[PDB]
């Protein structure tokens, strides 16, 4: 009875969605001028990681960036001068994520040890210290984004996102709903909501305060590897193993556009938006990042400079540059 | 001021000095992924390396080995297995005595072999629990032909090395299982990576040299590939 009733609400929800699709972003933006040909060039190549870079993050200052590598090292670089400010040796060599605090005082990371370790950079002593270890996840830690100096949100391979309190190290809110490994997180600009992409071809919008799944987005055919909010926080983009990127609207609750080409048959590892949101930077497994016109689905450009799989992307807060990590152990900066 | 510029450049030189010391240790150490199942007996192989994720360190001939057992994860491994694309070898441990779950081990080996990120990582296959397999065959209460009908028209290969006082049925059974894995290994693996089958039990005073010898062979063949010789 519930099996038929489950599809009753899905059909009713889908029916309500069709009542709001009077046009498409493809045909609305049919008349806008294209962005041209985005020709970014490697302005900086950061060397020093022995093994592949799994993730990196930008500081709010748009100059200091942190990168993680599968050799137990958390290097904090100076992008302007190519200088290693810190190089934090981790207990676990298998680290899949890293986050730089908005205040810059802390850095977090974790991976296959199921722990989001918090590192203190502004210690009164010479070197850094491990501030706190977060234990409580029952699978590999895939993402972790700081909210404040004391709140961090972590997405794990145990199909669970958790909101922590670094003061006590306990899990305050637990976000459950995904039936697959949660691989990516993105925080809204206001940090009141965060969107989450899992290995079940679905993305969920979570309320941080309420702790409940506000909306669920489907459209993708395979595992969503990457997710990123739009700058204005009313949309997000996802990248999956089906060699496609999709842009979803929060308010309309429908997929607005798809970023696919016939030549593209490799998964998207990372997505990012330029400061304006007009360019969607997507890293592929074909070793090069494509620049997508986010209002026309046209391939504006290509960042072909990496020898292995492109792991992570990031656009700076001020939008100066794009950092692009890869499995070749080199973090390059494009402008 | 310009005082910070030289201090910043000095701290980078100190950082880089430590990174050179770490790079020597990192390149000198071989990382192995230990795979297997509940009944495989990976633990017993770990117990033999007395010389979220469980790390083992053993030393053979003054070479450091790091074996990783990823025990703290769910049954879905398609995302975290991409972490171990840079390891020297995958230690694949199979319970050769359990024919019911043998096809799962064949399918797991085939997915590993054919993965886009593990298609250059040689597999050291350990066909564990040879003691249990030997006693299982002579009992006769369980037949391999029930689970693998191709066992009916299979004969022991010429290049077989039975142990002294070994029943021929055990040698045919134990080589058929080895050949099932080598059918997958040879179908897609062309010079990029190789399988290294072994037979082992819980009582083996060995498998630390076996991994060391097979890792030496993996490193040798990597060099000969660069020279375009192999």
């Amino acid at each position, epitope marked *: 009875q519930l099996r038929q009733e489950a599809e009753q609400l899905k059909n009713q929800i889908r029916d309500a969605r069709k009542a709001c699709a009077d046009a498409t972003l493809s045909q609305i933006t049919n008349n806008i001028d294209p962005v041209g040909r985005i020709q970014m060039r490697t302005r900086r190549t950061l060397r020093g990681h022995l093994a592949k870079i799994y993730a990196m993050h930008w500081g709010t200052d748009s100059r200091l960036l942190v990168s993680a590598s599968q050799d137990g090292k958390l290097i904090i670089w100076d992008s302007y001068t190519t200088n290693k400010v810190h190089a934090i040796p981790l207990r676990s060599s298998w680290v899949m994520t890293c986050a730089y605090a908005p205040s810059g005082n802390y850095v977090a990371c974790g991976g296959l040890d199921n722990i989001c370790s918090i590192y203190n950079l502004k210690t009164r002593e010479g070197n850094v210290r491990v501030s706190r270890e977060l234990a409580g996840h029952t699978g590999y830690l895939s993402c972790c984004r700081f909210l404040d100096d004391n709140q961090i949100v972590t997405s794990s391979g145990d199909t669970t996102c958790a909101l922590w309190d670094i003061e006590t190290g306990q899990q305050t809110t637990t976000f459950t709903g995904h*039936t*697959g490994d949660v691989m990516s997180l993105s925080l809204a600009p206001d940090t009141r909501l965060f969107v989450s992409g899992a290995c079940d071809a679905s993305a969920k919008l979570w309320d941080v305060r309420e702790g409940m799944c506000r909306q669920t987005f489907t459209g993708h055919e395979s595992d969503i590897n990457a997710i990123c909010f739009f700058p204005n926080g009313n949309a997000f983009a996802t990248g999956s193993d089906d060699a496609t990127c999709r842009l979803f609207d929060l308010r309309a609750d429908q997929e607005l556009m798809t970023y696919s080409h016939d030549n593209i048959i490799c998964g998207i590892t990372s997505v990012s938006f330029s400061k304006s949101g007009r360019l969607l930077l997507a890293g592929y497994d074909d070793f090069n990042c494509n620049v997508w016109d986010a209002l026309k689905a046209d391939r504006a450009g290509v960042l072909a400079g990496h020898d292995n799989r492109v792991s992570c992307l990031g656009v700076t807060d001020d939008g100066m540059a794009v950092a692009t990590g890869s499995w070749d152990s080199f973090l390059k900066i494009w402008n | 001021q310009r005082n910070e510029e030289k201090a910043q450049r000095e701290a980078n030189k100190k950082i880089e000095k430590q990174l050179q010391k770490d790079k020597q240790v990192y390149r000198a150490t071989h990382r192995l992924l230990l795979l297997g199942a509940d009944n495989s007996g990976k633990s017993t192989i770990v117990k033999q390396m007395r010389i979220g994720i469980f790390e083992t360190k053993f030393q053979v001939d003054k070479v450091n080995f790091h074996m990783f057992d990823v025990g703290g994860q769910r049954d879905e491994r398609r995302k975290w297995i991409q972490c171990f694309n840079d390891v020297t070898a995958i230690i694949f441990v199979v319970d050769s005595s359990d024919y019911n779950r043998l096809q799962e081990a064949l*399918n797991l080996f085939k*997915s590993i072999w054919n*993965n886009r990120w593990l298609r250059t990582i040689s597999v050291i296959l350990f066909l564990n629990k040879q003691d249990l397999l030997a006693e299982k065959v002579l009992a006769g209460k369980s037949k391999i032909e029930d689970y693998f009908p191709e066992f009916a028209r299979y004969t022991t290969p010429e290049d077989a090395t039975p142990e002294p006082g070994e029943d021929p049925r055990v040698t045919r059974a134990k080589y058929f299982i080895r050949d099932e894995f080598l059918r997958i290994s040879t179908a897609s693996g062309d010079g990029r990576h190789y399988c290294y089958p072994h037979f082992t039990c819980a009582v083996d005073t060995e498998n630390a040299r076996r991994i060391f010898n097979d890792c030496r062979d993996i490193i040798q063949r990597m060099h000969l590939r660069q020279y375009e010789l192999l």
Partner: nanobody, 128 residues
Framework: QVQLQESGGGLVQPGGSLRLSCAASGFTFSNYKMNWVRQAPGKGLEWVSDISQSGASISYTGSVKGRFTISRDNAKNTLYLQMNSLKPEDTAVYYC?????????????????????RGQGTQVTVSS
């Protein structure tokens, strides 16, 4: 939305012929390697058979070799498992599984406890 609905299966005598159709939707059928997985009552999930994108390559578990025939129809987006000589040991719930990635020779996690790209399944109860 990725959906895999299976039809057929139910009560049948030993040695009977039974056909399962898996209607796949919400993805490009022709790109993915398909699979068949069964779960015997009070037992773990077991892999039965797989078919490639085109149908050139086929595999079987060994217990169903020479009795089960797997065919795909790219045109109708359907997956088939033709049963010929059933046994009382074949009673299980048959799920039609799909490879996670769209152009790959490897099926990872198809027989997992909570795999996402599997159908609800059809009970195939075979008895006298």
């Amino acid at each position: 939305q990725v959906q895999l609905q299976e039809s057929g299966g139910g009560l049948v005598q030993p040695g009977g012929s039974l056909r399962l159709s898996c209607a796949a939707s919400g993805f490009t059928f022709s790109n993915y390697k398909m699979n068949w997985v069964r779960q015997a009552p009070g037992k773990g999930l077991e892999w039965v058979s797989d078919i490639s994108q085109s149908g050139a390559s086929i595999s079987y578990t060994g217990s169903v070799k020479g009795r089960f025939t797997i065919s795909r129809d790219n045109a109708k987006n359907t997956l088939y498992l033709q049963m010929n000589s059933l046994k009382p040991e074949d009673t299980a719930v048959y799920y039609c599984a799909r490879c996670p990635a769209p152009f790959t020779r490897d099926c990872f996690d198809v027989t997992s406890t909570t795999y996402a790209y599997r159908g609800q399944g059809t009970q195939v109860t075979v008895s006298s």
